[PDB]
Structures are given as C-alpha cells and as structure tokens.
C-alpha cells in the first residue's frame with residue numbers, strides 16, 4: 001500500500017509516524033535517529049511532552065548527515081491548552097520550532113478543544129482540583145492557527161481530540177479560511193471510532209490514530225485494564241499472518257485509511273513497527289478487529305470533565 005495520504009492542503013502525509021509522548025528526553029534523540037535510519041519520515045511531537053529539544057537534536061543531526069532532506073520529513077506538533085489565547089499562539093509555535101530546530105512545521109494541531117488559563121503550569125488548578133478554563137473560544141483559536149499558515153510557520157493546521165460537533169463547529173466557522181487537515185484521535189480495537197472517523201473522512205479531514213497499541217506505558221494504567229498486546233484474539237490474527245501483535249495493531253488503522261503513530265524508544269521495536277507494508281489483513285480480519293470495540297479510552301481526564309468544551313460527553 002502507498003506510504004503517504006493526500007491532505008486537503010495539497011501535501012502528502014506519511015501514514016506511519018513515530019510517537020514521542022513519554023519518550024524520555026535522554027532516550028528520544030537516539031530513538032528518532034534510529035527511526036529515521038530505518039525509514040520513518042513522520043514524527044509526532046508536542047510542547048507538553050517536554051522533549052521537543054531532544055527530538056530536534058535528532059532531526060537536525062539526520063538533516064546535517066544528509067540521511068534525509070527536510071522536504072522528505074513530516075513533522076507534527078501541537079498547541080497546548082494554556083496557549084489558546086490569540087496573542088499566545090504564534091509564540092507557542094515559535095517555541096516549538098526553536099526547540100525542534102525547524103523553520104516550519106508540516107502540521108500543527110490544536111492539542112485539545114479545551115483552553116486553560118495561561119501561565120507556567122500546563123494544568124492550572126483551582127483550590128479544589130478543577131482545571132481553570134480560558135474564556136477564549138475555539139473558533140478564535142482556529143483563526144489564530146490560520147494566521148500561522150499565512151505567515152509561513154506551518155504548512156497545514158489541524159485539530160486533536162475534537163468530537164464531531166466540535167469538528168462541525170470549525171467547519172461552520174463564519175469566514176473560515178482553511179479547513180482542518182487532520183483530526184488526531186485515540187483509536188484502536190477497543191475504541192474503534194467508526195462514527196467520528198466516517199464523519200471526518202466524509203469531510204476530507206484525515207484521521208490520525210493515536211495510542212494504537214493501547215498505550216501500555218500510560219502513567220495511570222491499572223491491572224484490571226484490558227490489554228491489546230496481550231489479547232489472545234489479536235495474537236491469533238498476528239500468528240496467522242506471521243507478524244507480531246503490534247504489527248497487526250499498526251496495520252489495522254492503515255487499512256481504514258488512517259495515519260498511525262505508534263511510540264517506542266526501543267530500537268528493535270522501532271524497526272519492527274515499521275515493517276507493516278509487506279502484508280494485508282483480510283476484510284474478515286478487519287471486521288473481526290472492529291468487533292472488539294468497547295469504548296475504552298486511554299486518554300480521558302477527570303480534572304477536565306467540567307470544562308465546557310470537554311470532548312467526551314458527546315456520543316462522538
């Protein structure tokens with residue numbers, strides 16, 4: 001299958017990228033260098049992951065060594081919730097660009113639809129633990145994102161963790177200048193997202209699946225939790241195809257015309273996870289994997305459930 005998908009901005013996006021959430025700063029530079037050496041051309045980043053400087057060291061070294069050209073990379077980062085105010089969006093982007101040592105991003109996403117009070121804290125809290133919101137709304141944040149396209153800092157803009165009513169809000173924005181190119185959302189056999197995906201795709205918005213392996217290193221994992229990598233039913237599909245379970249979990253979203261961004265800092269697993277272009281899941285396999293849906297989310301957060309734009313009350 002083709003390795004890139006066409007976006008509504010006219011550019012092509014690698015359907016496999018390397019995730020970097022939780023990648024330790026002392027390990028992520030080698031992880032990204034390895035990833036580039038074994039074929040990855042898309043890296044998924046965010047300011048809030050607190051490791052963009054070290055990701056950028058790897059990107060810069062591989063451009064300097066002429067392993068890849070900048071035009072061949074697809075680098076993505078995200079606007080954190082404490083920077084949704086108009087006046088803060090450019091600087092937040094510029095900080096990410098400086099850390100990543102780039103002069104443009106291929107894609108910049110609103111990380112979450114929820115804006116928070118600006119300041120040093122990523123999750124500003126009131127005395128009872130609720131996140132303190134920003135009154136800026138998401139349409140004004142979108143316009144500020146549009147300005148970054150028109151200033152040359154980013155080639156595409158998009159959104160992340162937006163539910164279909166919030167996607168619709170952007171699409172219906174008065175005076176909309178650029179549609180979102182991507183909506184990046186959690187997606188795996190336990191959270192198959194058929195409704196949201198169909199909606200986005202119907203509107204020409206490409207979807208990126210995050211936590212495709214079920215984020216087994218998520219800080220809040222509990223023992224009683226489902227585990228994709230250990231699901232005997234997924235293992236059996238992998239064994240049938242002579243691939244690992246992870247390879248199946250990565251190939252699954254690819255065949256739904258999604259982009260997917262598995263994370264690893266383990267060199268052998270970085271390589272393993274890229275070796276997913278040499279086999280196909282049958283339709284039956286795909287429908288079987290879709291059948292494991294249980295609306296189970298890695299990424300949900302109680303401190304933000306009262307925010308007016310919290311995305312996961314809505315059915316989708």
Ligand SMILES: NC(=O)c1ccc[n+]([C@@H]2O[C@H](COP(=O)([O-])OP(=O)(O)OC[C@H]3O[C@@H](n4cnc5c(N)ncnc54)[C@H](OP(=O)(O)O)[C@@H]3O)[C@@H](O)[C@H]2O)c1
Nearest residue numbers: 019020021210211212213214215217246262263264265266
């Ligand atoms: N937009 C957002 O709100 C959002 C939210 C969550 C995630 N994301 C993005 O999506 C990326 C992926 O999601 P994620 O980090 O939550 O989790 P994930 O990719 O589902 O899982 C990563 C975990 O799987 C392990 N792993 C990787 N390859 C493996 C393999 N072949 N076999 C067995 N274990 C393997 C990794 O271990 P090692 O690293 O130790 O090898 C790590 O513990 C993130 O890193 C981030 O870039 C975006």
Ligand SMILES: Cc1c(S(=O)(=O)c2ccc(=O)[nH]n2)oc2ccc(Cl)cc12
Nearest residue numbers: 021046081112114299300301304310311
């Ligand atoms: C969950 C959750 C998080 S997170 O789990 O810290 C996260 C993980 C990874 C990542 O990339 N981004 N955030 O931050 C949020 C901010 C707003 C809302 Cl409404 C929900 C959340």
